[PDB]
Amino acid sequence: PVIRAFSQPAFTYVFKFPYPQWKEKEWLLHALLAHGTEQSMIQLRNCAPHPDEDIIRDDLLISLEDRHFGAVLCKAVYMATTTLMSHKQRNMFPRCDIIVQSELGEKNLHCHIIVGGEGLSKRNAKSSCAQFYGLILAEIIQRCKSLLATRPFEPEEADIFHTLKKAEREAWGGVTGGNMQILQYRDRRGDLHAQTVDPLRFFKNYLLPKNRCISSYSKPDVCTSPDNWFILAEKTYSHTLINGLPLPEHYRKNYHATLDNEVIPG
Incomplete structure (x- = not known):
């Protein structure tokens, strides 16, 4: 189901996960955001790249499909965006289009958000950054707490958690x-x-x-x-989330091809 329309005016944001040591200490995020996947992530390190046969790899990826930490971060941001538009429209069921994509960058762990619909405009889009930031952090922080049903935080995990809460406080003050x-x-x-x-x-x-x-x-x-x-x-x-639905890895290139050929060439 290729997307064919996108509500205007539309704006694009970049969210940076506010933890500089995230590459060096990524297993902490596995636990805080994707509890239940931490072993799968480790096993993944030992997998052969395509086009080598590797059945373990193939299953591992199938089991991780909407559950790995990047996917969770991405759902969190999407929910936050929904909440954002909800506020802008004073409506529990906002009319908007939303795309979110998480990326493990060379330097930053980020999400791109394209959002469009009533309640956003040139007038408020830039100034809504802190509010948007805070809503995003609220979702992440809440997800972090789900780990607590299984065990208390390890010290480094707790460090990240308090880093998020501090960032969240600052967001409410527009930083x-x-x-x-x-x-x-x-x-x-x-x-x-x-x-x-x-x-x-x-x-x-x-x-x-x-x-x-x-x-x-x-x-x-x-x-x-x-x-x-x-x-x-x-x-x-x-x-990648398109209006709440994941674009599954195995359809990505075809999805792109359809957009590039039938829907919106150039």
């Missing part, structure tokens, strides 16, 4: 630390614009053609199936 930003561009004359003129084309051209990687300790050629490999792609994605 984001640069971890929540709106994407802006210039027209010819050099004026700034925060509105994403073409959300689908930005999705199709910048977010879609990436290979998957679900861990700093794994590789894209492990996490991406051969039919979905983008030969010139240098960056990766972890998980």
Whole structure:
């Protein structure tokens, strides 16, 4: 079911997970965000990249499919975005379009959010950064607590948790630390614009053609199936939500092809 329409005006944000040591200490996030997957993540390190046969790899990935930490982060941000639009529209069931994609970057663990609909505008989109940041943090923090049903926090895990809560407090005071930003561009004359003129084309051209990687300790050629490999792609994605529904790894390249050929060429 390829998306064919996107509510305007639309805006694009980048959320940075506010923990600098996240690559070095990623297993902490496995536990805080994706409790139940921590062993699967470890086993994944030992997997052979495609096109080598590796059945363990294939099952492991099937069992991880909507549950790995990047996927959870991505659902958290989506829920927060829903909550955001809910506030902007004073309506429990807001009319909006939302795409969210999490990415394990070279440096940052981030999510891109494209959101559009009534209640956002040029007038409020940039200024809503701190509020949006706080709502996102509230969801993450809540998810962290689910681990507590199984065991108390280990010390390093508790450090991250309090880092989040502090960030959340600062967000309520309008500080984001640069971890929540709106994407802006210039027209010819050099004026700034925060509105994403073409959300689908930005999705199709910048977010879609990436290979998957679900861990700093794994590789894209492990996490991406051969039919979905983008030969010139240098960056990766972890998980993608389109209006609440995941774009499954095995349909990504075809999904892109359909957008590029039938729906929105160029």
